[PDB]
Design an enzyme around this catalytic site. Structure first.
Site, PDB file in Angstrom:
ATOM      1  N   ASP A  79      52.464  11.595  19.000  1.00  0.00           N
ATOM      2  CA  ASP A  79      53.204  12.832  18.713  1.00  0.00           C
ATOM      3  C   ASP A  79      53.254  13.725  19.970  1.00  0.00           C
ATOM      4  OD1 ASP A  79      54.890  14.678  17.503  1.00  0.00           O
ATOM      5  OD2 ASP A  79      53.110  15.326  16.030  1.00  0.00           O
ATOM      6  N   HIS A 129      56.494   7.913  22.878  1.00  0.00           N
ATOM      7  CA  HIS A 129      56.904   9.123  21.927  1.00  0.00           C
ATOM      8  C   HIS A 129      57.332   8.224  20.614  1.00  0.00           C
ATOM      9  CE1 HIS A 129      57.721  13.011  20.862  1.00  0.00           C
ATOM     10  NE2 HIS A 129      58.820  12.677  20.426  1.00  0.00           N
TER      11      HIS A 129
END
Lengths: 234, 234, 234
Positions: A210, A206
């Protein structure tokens, strides 16, 4: 009777457990799930498995449909192909696709690499898995062709898990986990049919990828397995 | 109106939050799921619950079927019973099975230990849970019988969660999480029936337990609850 | 051809990846799931969407039903509203409810805050989301109204994920993740119907929130979306 005995672990298992904890302390891993209908793959294997064996002397499996659909999705979104190197705080793009395939043999897990998946078809992928599967089985599998992968398929579905969370191979940014095929009731067209479906999982970094790009990525793998003619189109 | 007030947390809650973060920073936890059909357990409880109460003065529940099936799976694969001690970098096998049972009373969570589960039956397990459930209810539950467990059942299913991820009790290597029982449509024999099914979860240490050994472990618990006569056979 | 090129990441992306890893190393995150039947919300939107547009000049969506049901559940259990500050090892209760709403625009993710949700209705929430959605779209969205939230809704369901695990906004203690709406066969009343259902997820801090309090919290959000007349009752 309460007996316990201390057997030691060797220095090889020391480093494996060491690399495993470095993969969690480096990247912020999350997981997202989806569900694939495996009907168009099985009837492809139902009618063409005989002309495939006569002409190529190979077996037609599920694995080559997931490797070819993974190279299709990676060349559309190159950000999943990227890697963050924290040495110079850099974002390393790549223009080649090398999918690592975890093939659990009797000895244990091995993760060899299929090189340059962009130009292949189902016949080329099936040659690469079959002869390299024989190499690691009799233990002639070299070290130099086990590193440099950019994406990883994990077949933990030959044992019958429903779904689960995989672990990222630490020089990469994502991993796909396929699972067991079960017959479940499905609402299709307003009616309740029974169709063989698979849960899939995608563990992603992450820091780089995205939250909406991981969903679009796994949705694109689904479209190229529910209908494999998209590989000829867009 | 925007009001906020700082109430402090005591030194006991300091250590609980401290031990909790040490369990994540030590072992690399992953999670795998499956699904159990609870039909053969309920009709066992439908016809034998009256002769069980007359002869033993106990209630026949779901919990004793999961504790006895857990001791069956652990004595077949001893690697789940093991613990890595990072003091001498050692792998500590055990030959006894002590399953900890989280029984949430009104006061809160308590985790007592059932000792030597290998020799018991459903009648012995039900005595142990019932009288020790009365001890922790009126707060006479000692400290000396809360430690040394090797495996943990977590009933978070008396509130109605679908599925979820549990947390490892830090002197152990695995934990089983059972959940709520719902009626869902099931494809059995090519037809769509309705049968009460439960999702289960298994959180395991990936430093010690392989990815394929956790799947085979949870698949073995399923076979001893979908058909409890396997405990007499293999 | 094997080409790779190093493009750098700016100092803004440095801090985003830095705050992301601090959110995992601070709090012990777990995840629990459930399932909501969305039939009473859609026929509310089927018959009242025309009188809503004529009288308010707004669109009637799914989002305002989840924000109002979230303020209902938080004012019943204030421990989910709390935050542990590790500066003085303190537990900071709050008496106001500010739900942050992640609204993914073309530019990217933005997380503005809806202030004082306790007194609003569906008409007030829909005004707040619509005009503030236009602010961040043309990039006039200030910094001062992006912080101080106490709870977070994450719509990752406009892309079609089945279910997944969200990440906690680090000044908070919980986050709700809604997902895509699919038609699946449902056993209702002993018969197999087809009804649109959604999987939801709740990622919570296990240092502060108990394992049974997170299940009761998500079960209370379900009751106020399967039947929105509970907001007038208890």
């Amino acid at each position: 009777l309460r007996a316990e005995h201390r057997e030691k672990m060797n220095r090889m298992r020391q480093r494996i457990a060491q690399r495993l904890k470095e993969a969690q302390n480096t990247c912020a891993m999350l997981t997202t799930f989806n569900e694939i209908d495996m009907s168009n793959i099985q009837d492809m294997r139902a009618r063409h498995k005989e002309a495939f064996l006569k002409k190529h002397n190979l077996k037609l499996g599920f694995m080559s449909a997931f490797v070819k659909a993974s190279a299709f999705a990676l060349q559309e979104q190159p950000v999943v192909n990227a890697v963050i190197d924290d040495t110079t705080k850099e974002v390393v793009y790549r223009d080649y696709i090398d999918i690592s395939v975890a093939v659990a043999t009797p000895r244990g897990l091995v993760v060899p690499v299929i090189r340059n998946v962009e130009t292949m078809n189902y016949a080329d992928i099936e040659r690469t898995i079959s002869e390299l599967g024989e190499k690691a089985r009799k233990n002639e599998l070299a070290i130099e062709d086990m590193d440099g992968g950019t994406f990883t398929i994990s077949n933990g579905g030959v044992f019958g898990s429903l779904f689960g969370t995989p672990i990222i191979n630490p020089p990469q940014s994502a991993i796909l986990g396929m699972h067991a095929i079960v017959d479940r009731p499905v609402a299709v067209g307003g009616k309740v049919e029974i169709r063989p479906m698979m849960y899939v999982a995608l563990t992603y970094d992450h820091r780089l990828i995205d939250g909406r790009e991981a969903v679009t990525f796994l949705r694109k793998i689904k479209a190229a397995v529910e209908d494999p003619r998209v590989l000829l189109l867009d």
